[model samples]
Target: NMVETEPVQGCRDFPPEAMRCRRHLFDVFHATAKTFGFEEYDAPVLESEELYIRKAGEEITEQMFNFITKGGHRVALRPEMTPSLARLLLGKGRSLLLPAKWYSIPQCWRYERRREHYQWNMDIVGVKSVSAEVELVCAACWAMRSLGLSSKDVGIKVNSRKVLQTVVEQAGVTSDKFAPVCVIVDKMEKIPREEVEAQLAVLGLEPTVVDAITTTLSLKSIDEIAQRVGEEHEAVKELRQFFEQVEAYGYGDWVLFDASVVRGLAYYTGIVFEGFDREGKFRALCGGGRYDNLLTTYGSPTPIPCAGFGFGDCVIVELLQEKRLLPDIPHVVDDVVIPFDESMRPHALAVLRRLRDAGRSADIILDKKKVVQAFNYADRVGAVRAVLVAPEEWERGEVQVKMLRGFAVPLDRLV
Candidate 1:
């Protein structure tokens, strides 16, 4: 029974129950973000393809939903939020207040041939401190708790980008090849060793440094890696301080020190972290880290150290489904109004307007209908309240309001 439907990809049609769960999660997500005094903001969905291509790297460049406009300019749907945020910040660098605390929930697009990957990209800017990073992690926890999930349901894995850079540098790897090394390190667990070594070799890494990085990856713990690279190195010291802060917040149970998470984006220059489900099958639920000099990339001479994260709406939905926590929610409003006859239409209109104005959710029937048909329509839409406007009632200045549960209320009480 296939028919023509609106075409979509890497997206999904959420059912009523799923939509309700999404509402609840987002309510918590935004509320928790505000609780920490972060302001809400967003960027346009459409932008020049060059904007995203510059920062998102090769993997995302081809997958972008791009096309030539009537004006002959190449444009695209935003696949991520960071670039947009960066553009906005750079645009306002001269006038807006510094140390911005901002957040956004946007429909991010990507080309993975996968559906249901859209999500809210939550982020904070203009602050760079271990404490600020901890706040981001805690805020993420706050979002989960708002959904009735406990620490046992999720964990945040953290590591400093500097830790990796320092280790690589100390192992005699040059700074010029740092980006390629990071790109390779990001895929260490997902790809094969031969491919990784070959890629690094192609990038012209010294044999000694490559072997050291391979050995470093095999180390069981961050501390072990630190031992090989000298714990006194600046990156190791920063990591130690960051971990101490983690312990101070008593979130150690919810956070772990993972050496392997090198967030794929080229912008991450300091601490990096990824939140994951405790069940361990899905990808990272959310991720972010410090980008110390991203402002410089946009023409600002001032060094603004910033940190933030993005939470995709769909992956967490999958996690909620797996946990059996998705609640059944009505997809549409749960109330309706019906005019018993054409003559009663004005009264029905008035009733619908009054209910809506009074902050009540309601819908009006345009076509004259029988009482039974109207009630069935209301029930079909999951409307718990149905207001009936009869000709006689309109003449009498009263209306009959019926609750799906069999209770009745007069017009005065409703309006």
Candidate 2:
């Protein structure tokens, strides 16, 4: 007979080994986020499809897992974390008295079926200023280093859409078509050169300007482009300063300045970046940047200079496995109670209750069996100590404790 699996796409049932690795990743990530005074938080997995449809680019609108209820309301699973976070910021506007530092591990859904792609999303919110942005980038880099990856294994590709917008304006691209142009440029790396040229033509740009914008996107280094485009733009100066800060964090080796990193989102107004594995096997592992105007769209007056990163649980696990660096974790039980006879059952139950009351784990042996067999069972389950009972020990008001990996010990030690 065969069992049918549940119909859930872009989600996963993690095996024990992968779960252990994911737990370790969370431990390290949370610890670091805490060190920066960020509190952990979360939101519902389901949201109104309109929440994403309003802000996400056309690509995201097409990829969201959407459905409608019988009552005639449209709903969908979240395809990303930023919109929910923006809503939370607005929802808690009055009571969030401080400059909030929040983090969340949320399951995000997207209609894609690539290997190693899953629903997990991580984020930090409620900070403003370029320095805050730099610090958030540093935290992402540090998270990877904590997991045994060096600068050689991954790099952060940094860009500023504002700077790119200025580049577009200089090329005579009008304001009416900036958003669509930004979205098209964001895909420049993934699509063919001819297709991007056609997209620029559709955006109502002159052929000469389209050719110029294509050439501008081709320039990879920020400094090199600044030299060619005249480094007087205020955004270019900020980009220079951002790199200097990256160098101060000793992550300059892992950061690249690229004008083509437009992030493909409507909300990103200023700085943007994406982290990529050096192996070139996967796309962006994580990405985020400033979106000062997002909260305003949700009806908040205060312009929060928000910057953060989202590291999914999928790609990182595959990368860890490929590197042969996944850790081995053994299953362990604190104690196993093996009653020697039917009369000892009550005493075993009492001990088990006491251990549980004291916040210790204890298992009662359901089958009355030989001492040797019980010991073997304990060993197989990774029990540290086994409690043995007999008529003589019961008469003496004590129990014989046998250490699974050593000799017999006291009852209190087992407790």
Clashes of each: 1, 0
lDDT of 2 at 34: 73
Give one digit per residue, the lDDT tens place, for model 1 in 296-341. 8767778777888888776787788788877676546656988887
Clashing residue pairs in candidate 1 are: 119-313
Question: TM-score: which candidate is best?
Answer: 2
Question: Which parts of model 1 have CA positions greater than 4 angstroms off?
Answer: 1-25, 52-58, 61-75, 115-117, 229-232, 240-250, 332-334, 391-397, 406-410
Q: Candidate 2 clashing pairs?
A: none
Candidate 2 — what's its lDDT?
A: 0.75
Q: Candidate 2 clash total?
A: 0
What C-alpha lDDT, on a 0 to 100 scale, does residue 59 get in candidate 1? 53
Model 2, position 39: C-alpha lDDT score: 77
* Runs with alpha carbons beyond 4 Å of true place in candidate 2: 1-3, 6-10, 15-18, 55-57, 112-126, 229-232, 354-359, 405-408, 413-415
